[model samples]
Target: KSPDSPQWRQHQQDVRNLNQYQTRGAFAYISDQQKVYARFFWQQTGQDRYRLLLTNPEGSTELELNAQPGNVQLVDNKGQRYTADDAEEMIGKLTGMPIPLNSLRQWILGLPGDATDYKLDDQYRLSEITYSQNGKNWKVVYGGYDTKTQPAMPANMELTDGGQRIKLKMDNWIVK
Candidate 1:
């Protein structure tokens, strides 16, 4: 069976579970221009439907993204919409990260191991992972585990592509 054959559903469910668990955080992601700080909220609104909201540093842009199956819709602060086809490009252009859309959900939940090649540490958490989009490669390093979570979570992460690197530091987490 192909990896996406049967496992895809489970993968999507896993991502949805994060929202059901009420995962929210304050994170910093480096854009091409500067480091952007944002608050992220994930919540499942319906069957296979959830929202990923990000608030930019200057409050100039707030991306409210809703995803389900093969469709994705993004609404910005000004009420502009971006469909699935444009979602990836728009996100990449704004974040300056070669973020692979198919794997981003997993990556955000500290579980990109399910996407492609990954290595877990002795604690059963990701140590390092390699993700590919189109033909480019990106390397990720996971460290600084937050032992408070039931299964633990990486508090610090680094993604590097070619000479560009962005460090994601999650300073706060709210669990409900």
Candidate 2:
């Protein structure tokens, strides 16, 4: 159905209802279309932590990182010891941005940053959700190829949540 159709609204509500408070566990294949590529298993807790277990293609190098609420921590893959402070510093340097602990939490949780306004459009089967914070805007559109009765499949999502000016592109997703 068209994005503006009544059926689209109904579908949006159906999908949102089904996803609310749902935790997702999946193998995320991340790539930058260049040398930066890796396969990671992620558990999105929906409440606090979004954890990632990264592994190399050869199964040699492995790392476990936990994106905690208001903080980020690197847990020793071989042990249980964690270096939260170091993780925060490393992430800051890597991104070259003064990413506050709170912002990190908001980013992973799909919530807008400080002083942001949001808009939701249920008329699109792909629920168009927009966030505007600090003169910067972002959008996330969520939908899928199948229904609850069908086999779990990847959804079509567009995330414009980076840098200055809002942008949009498709995302790789799997509903489980």
Candidate 3:
């Protein structure tokens, strides 16, 4: 959809519906080439807390993390904990992108979490979102969303800032 079309209201409503929907349980993230990197049980436990227990395709433990407004705690299967500060420095050094705690959460649910400039799919699912953050331009693309699913969820999401793209996918998303 165009940035400002007559269908704007309906699209906005779709986003609201997406946000109001609650989902619990597991989803996998895959590559553009379609290899699964990992899967995780995800839960938005509180208004400001997101809990995730991650594992490989075999369901063997990889890591678990809980994110709050401005922090994150990551624990490996061995139970070694990494604080928000460490995760931030490591991620910035590795990808030059913030931890993306909130964006990923919002994107997978088809919500931008803020006003945005975007495009939607032929089915009116959010296709792309461009928003300014901390004086920089950032955009996220949705591979697609489930039209045949129970709670309506995004199948894939990509976050990028001109470079360092991250590809994400979900096998299925079931609502609570």
Candidate 4:
């Protein structure tokens, strides 16, 4: 059922319940611009990791992070590690301070949170979710037009789960 349908409404509640109880498994994400790809993994106990790989027409960069309950760590691809205490400062040096995990989930799910505003469309698809964190406002869009597909196929659907913007465009995803 579509996200706006009655079935979906009940499903949303169930999913929210799961979110509150179950540990989220790994999920893949691709940007509307086809410039970013990310994989997220989390445990119910509060341990989580997110690996973000960003590729531009010019070059590419990778950011690997590990987070637990109230802590976060950044692991450099080159073999360096930045602990949770350094997360805010280190992230500030790169793009921005790391968005908190709780805030991340809320943003992805289109819920309200500190410095976060969302707009969902008629299809219950997220049109836009903007978050003001660190020193910048990051605007994320889902269900928008883009040609970025893992298998180079048309996107079947799109959704944003909190601050982790995920666009599902591939017919077959590598789910584990």
Best by lDDT: 1
3 versus 4: better TM-score goes to: 3
| lDDT values, one for every candidate | 0.60, 0.41, 0.59, 0.41
For model 4, residues 1-37, the per-residue Cα lDDT tens digits are 1334564345344334432222122234534433344
What order do candidates take by TM-score, descending? 3, 1, 4, 2
lDDT of 3 by residue, 21-43 (tens): 33433443333433334565666
Error of 2 at 54 (Å): 3.3
Clashes of 2: 0
Best to worst by lDDT, what's the order?
1, 3, 4, 2
Task: Please name the candidate that would achieve the greatest TM-score relative to the true structure.
Answer: 3
- What TM-score would you give candidate 4 relative to the actual structure? 0.46
Any idea what lDDT model 2 has? 0.41
* Candidate number with the higher lDDT (1 or 2): 1
List runs of model 1 lying over 4 Å from the truth.
1-19, 31-35, 44-49, 57-61, 93-98, 113-115, 171-176
In the range 1-176, model 2's lDDT, one tens digit per residue, is: 23446664454444334331222222222223212233455455443556555566776434566675456766443545455544446433543322233333333333333523333343333344565554434455544432343222223334444542211121333433
Instruction: Show where candidate 4 strays beyond 4 Å.
Output: 1-12, 19-61, 86-89, 94-102, 109-116, 132-136, 144-176
Q: Ten-residue segment with the worst summed lDDT in candidate 3?
A: 27-36
Comparison by lDDT, 2 against 3, better one? 3
TM-score of each: 0.66, 0.43, 0.66, 0.46
TM-score, prediction 3: 0.66
TM-score of 1: 0.66
Alpha-carbon RMSD of each model = 5.9, 7.3, 4.8, 8.7
